[PDB]
Nucleic acid binder design. Structure first.
Ligand code: MG
Ligand code: MG
Lengths: 107, 282, 287, 107, 282, 287
DNA sequence: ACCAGAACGAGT
DNA sequence: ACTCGTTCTGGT
DNA sequence: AAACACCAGAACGAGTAGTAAATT
DNA sequence: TTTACTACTCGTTCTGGTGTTTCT
């Protein structure tokens, strides 16, 4: 389990410049990228081969614009990540849980 | 998939952008469909769309529907799960008794062998010796129901000698809760592997899975064991841990979903043609 | 029960007082779960509660689902009790080759008869005579692709020198889609009848999942070619609306006019009975 | 040598909300945070005690607003950082160089 | 600081937000002032403001100004570098000869000892034996200039026997380039440590640093050695590597800046009071 | 050379044809590097080329720098050749205690007489007589803090019952800043004269980095007290502008009116000569 | 997929 | 500041 | 019920201009 | 030659709204 962060800035001045930002964001959300912050999106990849496969998929689905940057961190650092002000995302998709209860944990 | 999703509260489950959307009045959640492995809808308040069901069955998520007592009662089997489906069915008709007998004797050997280890953990050396008399003194096609006798000996070592599996207790209900979860697992794996769950290697809709699962039956008789004293909710909760915990298979520690998927694919390899070995789990 | 409920519009199905509630824009209908033999969900728009699914299995009803292409995808399978349509899969496997050969000979005979009759209605007298000459006496289990030559003659008379899959005009822009628009009917009926589309009569090819569906749709094929031929010169985007007249228009079956949905349901049931060696006459669709 | 990335999201609706964003950005640039991207800033820390000292300094100079998040990466991952489209910052401040020639390298 | 900054081209160096700003018509750059350690302004085209100089001297960067031949000619000496500066000056007056003699004999021992290892690397065993006759046969206050004789022997092993350090060529020019860079380092460290560079432990503005630097003199005679053949630009470029490379001191490998700062701080401990040991560099 | 150059305004100093170019808004002046003995940069606004610094060491000129508070911070140190002011540091160390004792006795004598005379000008006759009686005969190297009592009397007559550093009014909002506004002058002059401010005459305290600066400024402190006393009732913001009359106003020294910059420069030079045991009369500042 | 080596972090 | 243990990545 | 399309809005974010001050 | 305001300006950016469409 390692996290991947995809920081991007992409220009919004022409129709074709905004017609590929929307496509990029649709692809990002479609493949399961949790919005850490505005333009900072993260995915929890369970093994390294998943990271290689999705790096290939991102390269194949490049908007070919702006500045799209990938950082791959171990889950240790994504869990040691410090929030000065704000709260962590508590959603199920943001955790490495294998048993997940959309409801009442029986405890 | 790797996540296991258990929905116990009133909600509406829907689809959006390759995500399962859970919308309770308190919360809205999105889980990527590739991550989910089991969708266990225990409560009768879930209002799920049919468009979600389509994407769930293309992604081969094991959707299980329960009843008012939160006991499994149904699950979804995809009609078309493999590209080679027609070929595997046509070959399944051509499953001669000579390979079926060897496959079932191997699988029953694995079941009794894995039964012996629990007796070793249950501090029953003489009961393990009886299980070994049934195991080394193995039966082909069970002429004397030696598998049933070994199961009875293992239970007598496991539960009280008066206790019977058919009788209704808290233990005897969780021991079937887990069996139904595992049966759904193996039915999903058989139907994905292109075979028919309704055929049997030794009719009934789950005859194929009910035999391939047998070596993994002691996985359920140990979780119930270690928590047999407490009420049904507790044995249910610890039975849920099969999805979460890790078990040793082959030469590596893997989660029970992967062991189920790999085991349910090697048996089909040998049944299709006598060029494979039935794998052993322990 | 007897009623097979076909939910093919945006709906919400729920359960109150032993009654399937099928709510939509038109009518929030009342249906009793005692009468419902087979619930068939035909779209992705439908919304169903888990409570309804709980009490659809209690009454032992077959809950069949469909995907975006209106094709069967998954039937809700109960652990404890099972429908009366779950025994055909165990006898479909044991179907004898003789019944398959006879019923395939009859189905292919109907296909050639329909194509030849429509050629007689397509202003090709010599071509109609030749199409019937391909099956003047239906070749009993023809080993070669004589049906290939019959299709060549029929499609040559219908759409010109070539009507193969290669040409990108409405010759395939309509026939491809229509031939998939009726494959859904036969696949859905076959799975409704408790049969497996994957293995079918004379379906030596394992490359097609919808074996029995196509094999039993073979007689019903010429409707699509007729509707295409009438509106052939129009664009494909026009044929997307023209081809939908199948559901609205009623065709003659069993001596009376019926919607093609009822016709395909009856034809599928009768063929399935025939392959079970019940002795019923293999159903006929011709005009 | 490890890098620190400080992704921040801070509201701009009131004067006090914008009077602490400007102060935060002035502090960020003052302590040597290279603008990786819009609101994504990075610093190269030579040892771990520097990381602890600057974490304490950031906690002492918190704007107490928005969502400010610190991720600490080893320099290996910040150098394995993948740019789908765009170019790396080639400035001297972004490198772990010890001999630096603002001019002509004698090679 | 850790970076070493060498400005060789026309530019304007200015201050903004704790940063050194370098602006040529080609480029604009910002370097955080805490990162810089040496600002080596080789070219006479740099146009640097005086506000930058103030922040540079508060942050104690070793700003070195060179001449037309890119040879160092000046550097900045902070008047007030230590809060305890006045007390170190007043104590520096109270530097009796008894502790100065011991510290200088220790430092000269370190210089000759470090000279011996280079002869070991120079494949001169007999020259190393002469250096050892000077080393083990050590001198107190150099009655016979045994330090100079040992330096002459090391040079004769190092350069040709006819060659002299005072003579002029490429080697005896880079050997002084490096000596001036190191002298700036040790002058900065002495003035930061609160002492006076103009005093001497055994007048002239760099007498204190010119003795404390002595054990690190062979750091410069080895870089010049390994590249003695090529032209002056090459030996200058490899001399720049003292800032970049790593040298073993105490029990760890540290860059020469840390060795210079560390060494120049225990010598002052012993001169201030006879309660410290002169550290050995090797 | 003889000229010392005090660059105090926003300027740009460069080098062309053996000439220091000192460009500003007023006059892009021409100065010859041959005449320049000591270049003194007084502010942080100045821009200097590296070429000029190259030709400032070549002619052996002391290039002194100043920080935001106009206080000496760093002198450009040449490797090869050195200024004629680099020998005082090594003779400042060897300064004998006797010369320091005499100079401090005269320095505090001038301070006490200045305060007493200004009290005579401050309409406190009895207080002026008492301040004079604190040093009616200047106590030769007084061990106790009798100067503390003299300062107590002077400040009691000046600013009321208490004029200590605790009070937050313009008594310290002006005197403290003004006493730092003339500390800059004496520190800069002492470092210009080739002396070290860090060690000073009778400067037993090691917490004072500006030892000699303060010790020689002691006679020159009273001007600040006069200026604040005249404008005491006004706010400190006003005193920030009032105190700047030090530079503009000319005071009597050596028998003639001069700007206080020239006065402090000459006073520092003469005190340094006296500390050198040259035999010169320790300079006098009193009105 | 497993094992070994290297690097990083924490503790004494 | 040093050393050991744990984890991550690379290679066979 | 969901995907696809763009349009529009309200919020996030950096840079540039201009004025003021510049020895506690 | 710096830092210290607030101002405004143009670019980045996510969400909401309305229309359209659907078994090749
Ligand atoms: Mg961004
Ligand atoms: Mg942001």
């Amino acid at each position: 389990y390692m996290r991947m962060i995809l920081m991007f800035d992409m220009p919004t001045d022409t129709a074709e410049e905004r017609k590929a930002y929307r496509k990029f964001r649709k692809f990002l959300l479609s493949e399961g990228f949790i919005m850490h912050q505005f333009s900072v999106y993260s995915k929890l990849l369970l093994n390294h081969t998943a990271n290689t496969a999705m790096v290939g998929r991102l390269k194949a689905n490049n908007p070919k614009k702006g500045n799209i940057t990938i950082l791959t961190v171990t889950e240790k650092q994504f869990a040691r990540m410090i929030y000065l002000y704000g709260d962590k995302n508590t959603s199920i998709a943001n955790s490495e849980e294998r048993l997940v209860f959309l409801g009442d944990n029986y405890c | 998939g790797w996540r296991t999703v258990v929905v116990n509260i009133h909600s509406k489950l829907s689809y959006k952008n390759n995500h399962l959307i859970f919308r309770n009045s308190y919360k809205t959640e999105m889980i990527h469909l590739s991550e989910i492995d089991i969708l266990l809808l225990e409560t009768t308040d879930i209002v799920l769309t049919t468009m979600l069901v389509k994407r769930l069955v293309d992604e081969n998520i094991l959707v299980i529907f329960c009843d008012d007592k939160r006991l499994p009662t149904a699950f979804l089997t995809p009609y078309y799960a493999r590209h080679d489906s027609s070929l595997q069915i046509a070959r399944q008709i051509a499953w001669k008794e000579n390979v079926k007998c060897e496959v079932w004797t191997a699988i029953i050997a694995q079941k009794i062998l894995n039964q012996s280890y629990y007796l070793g953990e249950c501090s029953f050396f003489e009961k393990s010796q009886s299980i070994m008399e049934l195991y080394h003194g193995l039966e082909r096609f069970d002429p004397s129901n030696r598998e049933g006798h070994s199961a009875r000996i293992y239970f007598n070592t496991l539960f009280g000698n008066d206790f019977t599996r058919e009788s209704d207790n808290d233990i005897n209900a969780a021991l079937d809760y887990g069996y139904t979860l595992l049966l759904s697992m193996f039915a999903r794996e058989v139907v994905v592997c292109g075979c028919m769950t309704q055929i049997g290697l030794k009719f009934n809709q789950f005859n194929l899975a009910s035999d391939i699962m047998e070596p993994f039956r002691p996985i359920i008789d140990r979780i119930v064991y270690q928590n047999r004293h407490n009420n049904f909710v507790k044995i249910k909760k610890e039975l849920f841990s099969i999805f979460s915990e890790t078990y040793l298979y082959n030469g590596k520690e893997m989660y029970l979903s992967n062991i189920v998927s790999d085991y349910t694919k090697k048996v089909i390899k040998a049944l299709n043609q006598l060029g494979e070995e039935i794998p052993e789990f322990r």
